[PDB]
Structure formats: C-alpha cells, structure tokens
Design a protein around this ligand. Structure first.
Ligand SMILES: Nc1nc2c(ncn2[C@@H]2O[C@H](COP(=O)(O)OP(=O)(O)O)[C@@H](O)[C@H]2O)c(=O)[nH]1
Ligand SMILES: [Mn+2]
Ligand SMILES: [Mn+2]
Ligand code: NA
Length: 604
C-alpha cells in the first residue's frame, strides 16, 4: 500500500488494473512520491516552473511559453542498438538473415531480458517522483484510438507527453476497466546519485535499454531521458507494439504522414506517405503549395493508424497530439508552416539560444540582427565561422498539433480520414524518376519493400526499418493480405524522388512547394484520368501531363528517363537484399513481382 506517498490524485480512484500496475512498480522502483497526472494547465505550468528553478530547462524569453532543454551529450537520440523486442521465438520478431545480423530488428530472449530488468529497475526511482501518465493515442474515445499508462521519473517526459499525446484525468475516465498498454520508464539515476550529473540531465547510457514485450502488452525503457526512448507513445507504442496488434487485428500501423489535399474545384482527397529519414517528409506534410487554388492540410506528420471501414474505405487517424520534429533545417524561408507552429507553447531540446532569448539552428535561413549572439546546445559561445554546429543534428521541437496553421479540420475526427493514395519516398541522385505509380497492389507492396534511405545505399522498406514490431516477411504478407478483403478500396500506390540530379550534381526538379504539381497528377490519377504512360517500372506522367507553368525550362525527359542498365543493377540489388535479409519469409507475391520487374527490364 503506497497510499501514503501519493502527492496528487488517489490510488483509490484508479481502475483496478491501473492501480495494480502503479503499486507493483512503486514496490519495485521505490519512488519517494507518486504523482497521478491530471493533464491540467495548472499541473503543466507548475512542472515547467519547477524544472526551470532546478536548471533542467530554461525559459525562452523571446516567445510565449517556450522552453529549452540541453541534454547530456551521451543521451541525444533514439538508440537502435539498445532497442529490442522480446518474443518466445526469434523468428517471429525478425527474419533469420542468410548471414550476419538482421538489419530489420533486434530480438532478445525472455531469459536475457529478465536478467537485464533485474539488473536495472529495483530501487531505480529512489528519492524521485514516479509520475503516472494516463494517455490516449488517437482522439479520445475514437474507435481507432488505444490507451496507455506511462510511469516515469522524468518531469521532462511528463511535459513532452502532454504535448505528444492526450493525457490526464479524462483518459482514465474513458479507460474504465479496459485494456491498456503498460509503459514503464526510468532515467535510471536513483538518489543519491552514484555518478556525476551532466547538464542537469539524468541518464544512464551504460545501462540504456528500450524493450518491447508485445505478448504482455508491455514497453519497458531504462536509462535514456530522450525522445523516442522515453516518450513511449511515439515509436515504442504507436509503431512497434501497434504494428503487432495491427497484424493480429487486421489493420496497419505505419510510419506515414497523412495529408488532405483540395483541388481548385473544392474536391478533397487524403493521402498517406512513408519516407525514410532525410527524404522530405516534414517538408511535404507542411507543404505550402505553389499551384493556385490548391490547398494542402496536415492530419499527421509521422505516424498513421489505418483500418478498413464497413464500406471498404481505408480510414486513417494520427495517433499523436503533437509534432516531435527535427529542428535543424526547419527554414523560415522554405518551411513557414512549421515555423508558425513552434512560436508558442513549444519545448525545444538541444537547439541553440540567441542572446535575445530566441532559438537557432543550422538551416534556419534567418539572418540575425547585427549585435545578436548565439549560445550553442553545449552551452558555449558560438559563431557561424565555427567548426561544430550550434544545434545537435538530432535536436527537436515538441509542439501542439492544434497550433499548425494548416492542421486539417478532420485531424481529430474519430472515424479517421479516407485514404485514397499511399506514397513511398526516397532520395536517389540517379535513375529513379520524380514520380511513378505501381501497376497493382502487389506491385505497390514490392515498391514499398524496395525503398532506400537517403542516397540509395541502405534499405528502409516502408520507412519502417527501425520500427517493425515483428518479422518483416510476415509484415509484407500482412500488407499483401489487404487485397483479399472483400470490398476493400485499395489506395493507389506511388513512389516519389525529389532528389534526382543532372550530370553536374544539380537537382533536376525544384521541389518544396513545387511538389504540389506532383500531387495534382496523383489526384487526377486517382480520379481515373488518362494522364499516364506505361513503363517497365510502372506508370509515369505522359508528355505534358505535369503542370510546369511558371517553372521555366524543366528537363522532363531526363527527370523521367529510365535506363535499362540502371534498372538491371537495381533489380539485382533488390534480389540480393531480399534473399539475404528476408529469405524463407519472403512472400510468393513479392518474389513474383521481383521476377516480373526483371522480365520487363530485360525486354528494354
Ligand atoms: N531539392 C529538394 N530538397 C528537399 C525537398 N524536400 C526536402 N528537401 C531537403 O531535404 C532534406 C530533408 O528534408 P526533410 O523534409 O527535413 O526530410 P525528412 O527527414 O524526411 O523529414 C532537407 O535538407 C530539405 O531542405 C524537395 O522537394 N526538393
Ligand atoms: Mn518529421
Ligand atoms: Mn518518424
Ligand atoms: Na540541461
């Protein structure tokens, strides 16, 4: 009975199973206090002032209610090598690669995880508050939403979870005696500190471990205070645990933005798009379109949960409540919609601070008034001349989604939005056209399976490489199975590449807002317009089908050129990759698409 240690709320008012989860872990971790979060502005405002007084965060005096946290340089990112999924059988979690280690996940035995847990959690919250965060992933009470409870000893996690999820008393009220995902987090620095605290940022890099136990609906994370390791709704819940549940239950949990696009005729369509890192995701989600009379609005910028409704529509929700975006590169010039979003009520992590109490980072493209100086994310004076960057490359804004000037009016609709197109993206200086369209659902799944990360060297199928909750081959089979659902209205699948270059190393396409022109083509293709030419790789825009008005001389022949020798090498590369990494778990349909593509190229 830990009743005597409760400093907000009451163990008595919690649902039975929630109380068991709290108390059981209070027994294990030995926190000094238990704070049951209410999600109120009062609670939030006071928690921030507290962190401020303690030096954990600084207030950003130039803005309305914005804050800056600077971490221990050892704890600056989601850490893949410490991220594991626990299942009875390794093969259910990752395929067995022909040689070496899987690139598609990282399994740990139940036995090894048990030893790891015992080595970390007993007594780990001594002298700290355990916060109890009741949170909804997705609009509160939506049939597509799922509830979690996160226990944490980090006020930073509490504040960031309030922005990134729906959290507080109303969630407990909606949960009742229902099922929830159990989320346990600790920074792993019980008091009295065994080791020096760096930058007022509690962490334990040596023992950092982020574990997922899908059969137990548990996520357990130790030693990192940061982002994807500590905000458990984001990746651990909404991709890793969720993709497994989606597999079980017949839906999809994906690393996709969701956008709503309206043509000049006022007709609106929703599209989902998966991109690997540095391939253009945030710029597309926040697009300020250049074509007159087009509108682009954002439902979500990172994760999508999608489920076919009774009518066969693939309905998607954004399970998040906020944007947890990479700050560097967010440009006042070319990403105005992100910039507007983050002007108030935003928590920044590891960015630079200007002497007038503003934020700064590489690629902001905003000259400072003469006189204004810059303090780096390492708390050192900094000048544009310097060797090291002023902001960590993985530094972040954490901002409420409702503040996005282009947030879609249906971004919280409980039944989700009807997805009519899915886009897979990449970054290839050569050989891959600006846009092409899959020949079929099965071809589309192959195209997602063949995705590469920036530069085209490494594979990031479906932009899910770090995030698969289970065996990737089985994931492909799951996608392929959607085709056999009666009445399913299967979205059209496209692949985009903003980054193709000419022989000089210059981009052949201007991109950014100009990508509205590619959306226009996709939109028309969904409506059944005859604006496509068949090629060995799929459909591409016909001559003159793209609106190039205003762009001057665009070399569409090169931008859309398909080379036999390039595509021969590409098919051989995909073949090798799928054999090595997926092998016995590769679906028949995928192998069949590989053979079909190889054959179409061979006839060039
Ligand atoms: N040439 C070109 N560059 C782009 C485009 N979209 C984004 N970028 C650049 O590519 C990099 C990554 O873009 P970003 O949208 O941050 O990628 P994300 O990591 O997938 O969100 C940044 O340097 C952007 O300026 C585009 O349409 N064309
Ligand atoms: Mn993003
Ligand atoms: Mn992401
Ligand atoms: Na700090």
């Amino acid at each position: 009975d830990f009743s005597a240690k409760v400093i907000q709320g009451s163990l008595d008012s919690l649902p039975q199973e929630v109380r068991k989860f709290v108390e059981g872990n209070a027994q294990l971790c030995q926190p000094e206090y238990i704070h049951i979060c209410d999600g109120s502005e009062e609670e939030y405002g006071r928690l921030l002032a507290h962190m401020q007084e303690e030096g954990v965060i600084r207030k950003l005096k130039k803005y309305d209610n914005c804050w800056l946290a600077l971490t221990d340089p050892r704890d600056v990112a989601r850490i893949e090598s410490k991220t594991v999924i626990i299942t009875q059988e390794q093969r259910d979690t990752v395929p067995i690669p022909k040689s070496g280690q899987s690139q598609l996940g990282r399994w740990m035995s139940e036995e090894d995880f048990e030893k790891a847990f015992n080595a970390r959690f007993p007594g780990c919250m001594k002298g700290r508050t355990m916060y109890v965060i009741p949170f909804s992933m997705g609009p509160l009470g939506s049939p597509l939403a799922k509830i979690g409870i996160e226990l944490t000893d980090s006020p930073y996690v509490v504040a960031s979870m309030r922005i990134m999820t729906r959290m507080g008393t109303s969630v407990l009220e909606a949960l009742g005696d229902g099922e929830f995902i159990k989320c346990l987090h600790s920074v792993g620095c019980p008091l009295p500190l065994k080791k020096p605290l760096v930058n007022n940022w509690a962490c334990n890099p040596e023992l950092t471990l982020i574990a997922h136990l899908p059969d137990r609906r548990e996520i357990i994370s130790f030693g990192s205070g940061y982002g994807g390791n500590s905000l458990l709704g984001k990746k651990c819940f909404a991709l890793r645990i969720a993709s497994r549940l989606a597999k079980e239950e017949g839906w999809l949990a994906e690393h996709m933005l969701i956008l709503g696009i309206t043509n000049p005729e006022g007709k609106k369509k929703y599209l989902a798009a998966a991109f690997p890192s540095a391939c253009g995701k945030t710029n597309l989600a926040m697009m300020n379109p250049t074509l007159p009379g087009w509108k682009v609005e954002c439902v979500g910028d990172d994760i999508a949960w999608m489920k076919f409704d009774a009518q066969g529509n693939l309905r998607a929700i954004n399970p998040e409540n906020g944007f947890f975006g990479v700050a560097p590169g967010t440009s006042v010039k070319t990403n105005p919609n992100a910039i507007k979003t983050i002007q108030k009520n935003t928590i920044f992590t590891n960015v630079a601070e200007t002497s007038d109490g503003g934020v700064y980072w590489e690629g902001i493209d905003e000259p400072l008034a003469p006189g204004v100086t810059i303090t780096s994310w390492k708390n050192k004076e900094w000048r544009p001349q310097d060797e090291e960057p002023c902001a960590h490359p993985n530094s972040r804004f954490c901002t409420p989604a409702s503040q996005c000037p282009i947030i879609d009016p249906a971004w919280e609709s409980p039944e989700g939005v009807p997805i009519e197109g899915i886009i897979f993206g990449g970054r290839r200086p050569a050989g891959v056209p600006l846009v092409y369209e899959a020949l079929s659902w099965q071809h589309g799944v192959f195209v997602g399976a063949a995705m590469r990360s920036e530069g085209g060297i490494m594979h990031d199928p479906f932009a899910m490489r770090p995030f698969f909750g289970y065996n990737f081959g089985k994931y492909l089979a799951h996608w392929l199975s959607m085709a056999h659902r009666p009445a399913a209205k299967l979205p059209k699948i496209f692949h985009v590449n903003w980054f193709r270059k000419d022989k000089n190393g210059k981009f052949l396409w201007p991109g950014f807002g100009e990508n509205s022109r590619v959306l226009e083509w996709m939109f028309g293709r969904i409506e059944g317009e005859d604006s496509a030419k068949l090629t060995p790789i799929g459909y591409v825009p016909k001559e003159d089908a793209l609106n190039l008005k205003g762009l001057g001389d665009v070399n569409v022949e090169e931008l859309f050129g398909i080379s036999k020798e390039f595509w021969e090498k590409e098919v051989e590369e995909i073949d090798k990759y799928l054999e090595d990494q997926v092998n016995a778990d590769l679906p028949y349909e995928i192998e069949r698409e590989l053979r079909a593509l190889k054959q179409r190229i061979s006839q060039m």
